[PDB]
Amino acid sequence: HWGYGKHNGPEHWHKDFPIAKGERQSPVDIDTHTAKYDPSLKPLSVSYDQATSLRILNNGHAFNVEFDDSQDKAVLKGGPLDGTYRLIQFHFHWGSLDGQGSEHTVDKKKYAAELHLVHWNTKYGDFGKAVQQPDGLAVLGIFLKVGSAKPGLQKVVDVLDSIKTKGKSADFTNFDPRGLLPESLDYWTYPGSLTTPPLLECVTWIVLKEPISVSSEQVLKFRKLNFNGEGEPEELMVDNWRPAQPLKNRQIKASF
Numbered sequence: 001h002w003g004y005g006k007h008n009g010p011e012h013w014h015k016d017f018p019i020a021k022g023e024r025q026s027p028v029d030i031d032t033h034t035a036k037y038d039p040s041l042k043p044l045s046v047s048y049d050q051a052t053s054l055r056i057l058n059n060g061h062a063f064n065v066e067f068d069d070s071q072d073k074a075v076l077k078g079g080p081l082d083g084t085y086r087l088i089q090f091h092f093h094w095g096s097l098d099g100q101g102s103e104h105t106v107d108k109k110k111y112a113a114e115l116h117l118v119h120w121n122t123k124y125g126d127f128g129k130a131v132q133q134p135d136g137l138a139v140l141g142i143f144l145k146v147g148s149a150k151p152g153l154q155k156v157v158d159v160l161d162s163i164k165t166k167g168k169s170a171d172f173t174n175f176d177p178r179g180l181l182p183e184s185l186d187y188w189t190y191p192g193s194l195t196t197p198p199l200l201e202c203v204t205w206i207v208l209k210e211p212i213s214v215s216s217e218q219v220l221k222f223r224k225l226n227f228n229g230e231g232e233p234e235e236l237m238v239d240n241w242r243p244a245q246p247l248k249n250r251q252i253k254a255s256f
């Protein structure tokens, strides 16, 4: 099955998921000189004071921190969006080296990692239904650059040892996502898709201008994770990112 290896990597995904070559894929390069300043763009509204984290899980392609989304607990609104989007999970994409790892690029510049905070439009009732609509999801993308440690990320880093292989999970309550946000909420937005199979084109991307910094040691722990399950040949979970895809006439709007 699909992965990031040379035999099952992104270049092969189109075979089982033809949408891989659709008209609104994701990730893309943000050409900052071609991005359009849209004055009609509203400021983002991140309401995560009430977020209820549940657990963390190694799903074989990344680690996900899941939240309780049975109620309007942690939501995203404003920006290019209409209605409320509820946080379901967050995960990262990282590289084998500091010079690569992000999915989206800014003027072809790659970051060490990229944080994705996944939300689904509540008008559709459930996540499964949101994935069948063109305005079904909203993913908040935050770039990670190597520098100073991120206080707020440390809690995640420490549990990683507990979910080393695919299929492992650990309780992960009382995690506050606000600790992962940059100071500024300026963003780029464009119509896109999931970045992993099934690559559904249901996402409104909100990519923050300002990156968060993490330490070398924080990033290193990410790379200690395994793609494989327990008792199988060890394969380091690195470079779980997809290359930039053709914009194809879509327009990237800037809130700044």
Ligand SMILES: NCC(=O)NCCOCCOCCNC(=O)c1ccc(S(N)(=O)=O)cc1
Residues within 6 Å of the ligand: 116, 118, 127, 128, 131, 139, 193, 194, 195, 196, 197, 198, 200
């Ligand atoms: N009805 C059968 C069926 O499979 N329906 C599935 C409904 O939607 C399924 C989508 O796959 C779910 C798993 N993936 C994700 O949730 C998921 C979420 C976000 C991103 S990303 N990287 O673009 O932020 C990538 C993947």
Ligand SMILES: [Hg+2]
Residues within 6 Å of the ligand: 130, 131, 132, 133, 134, 135, 136, 200, 201, 202, 203
């Ligand atoms: Hg869709």
Ligand SMILES: [Zn+2]
Residues within 6 Å of the ligand: 091, 092, 093, 116, 195
């Ligand atoms: Zn992602």
